[PDB]
């Protein structure tokens, strides 16, 4: 019993990337490592309840309890003080990460209103992708009747890639809906 995305990466995607880049040793095949979802509330500095709403949204979508991030710096323009909750974060690894990736790619992304594609320019040197949503309605794990206010995220997919090209190739093989440039 294996996640189908993990099965695919193990069998066909690994061989494809090995052919494409001709890695000298078997352990250069760039694979994903973990997925991090960030929901920076910001407005929680006034009202604490928004952090709990973010907690519930992340727990329902990703499937595991999120970790509240403390404000490590005090600032007055955002009237931020040290220690109050600011955002939530979940680190996804292994089978849970694979199944979340499958769910998002095959269900959540096409549910985006006028979804035209994700720019393949968002990698940073080492082929780690970081995009960001605006609302949370795309997931059916949450309910539009249940929700009351949109809450975007920052999904980060750190891989074993060393270059932007290798990372974009691996993610494109994974089934990522990139644009064309």
């Amino acid at each position: 019993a294996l996640p189908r995305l993990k099965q695919r990466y193990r069998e066909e995607i690994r061989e494809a990337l090995q052919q494409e880049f001709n890695y000298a040793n078997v352990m250069q095949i760039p694979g994903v490592v973990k997925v991090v979802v960030n929901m920076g509330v910001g407005d929680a500095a006034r009202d604490a309840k928004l952090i709990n709403g973010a907690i519930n949204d992340l727990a329902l979508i990703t499937g595991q309890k999120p970790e509240v991030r403390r404000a490590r710096k005090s600032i007055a323009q955002f009237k931020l003080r040290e220690g109050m909750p600011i955002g939530a974060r979940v680190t996804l690894r292994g089978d849970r990460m694979w199944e979340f990736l499958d769910r998002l790619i095959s269900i959540a992304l096409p549910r985006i209103r006028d979804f035209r594609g994700l720019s393949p320019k968002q990698f940073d040197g080492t082929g780690n992708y970081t995009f960001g949503l605006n609302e949370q309605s795309m997931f059916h794990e949450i309910d539009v009747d249940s929700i009351d206010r949109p809450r975007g995220m920052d999904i980060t997919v750190v891989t074993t890639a060393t270059n932007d090209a290798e990372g974009r190739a691996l993610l494109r093989a994974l089934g990522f809906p990139f644009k064309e440039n």
């Binding site: 727990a59 595991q64 769910r103 095959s106 269900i107 992304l109 549910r111 979804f115 059916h140 794990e141």
Partner: protein, 48 residues
């Protein structure tokens, strides 16, 4: 795994407009998930 810290998990069958039965884990408790659109039918994935 801390036991009482996470929500429930269940194998859920995702149903698209194409007719594909998708036995996979999720937290929705309906058993079978039905959705109108997915990667197998969306115009961007299908080039339309």
């Amino acid at each position: 795994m801390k036991t009482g810290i996470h929500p429930e998990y269940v194998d859920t069958t995702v149903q698209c407009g194409c007719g594909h039965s998708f036995t996979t884990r999720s937290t929705k408790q309906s058993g079978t998930i039905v959705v109108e659109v997915c990667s197998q039918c969306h115009p961007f994935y299908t080039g339309k």
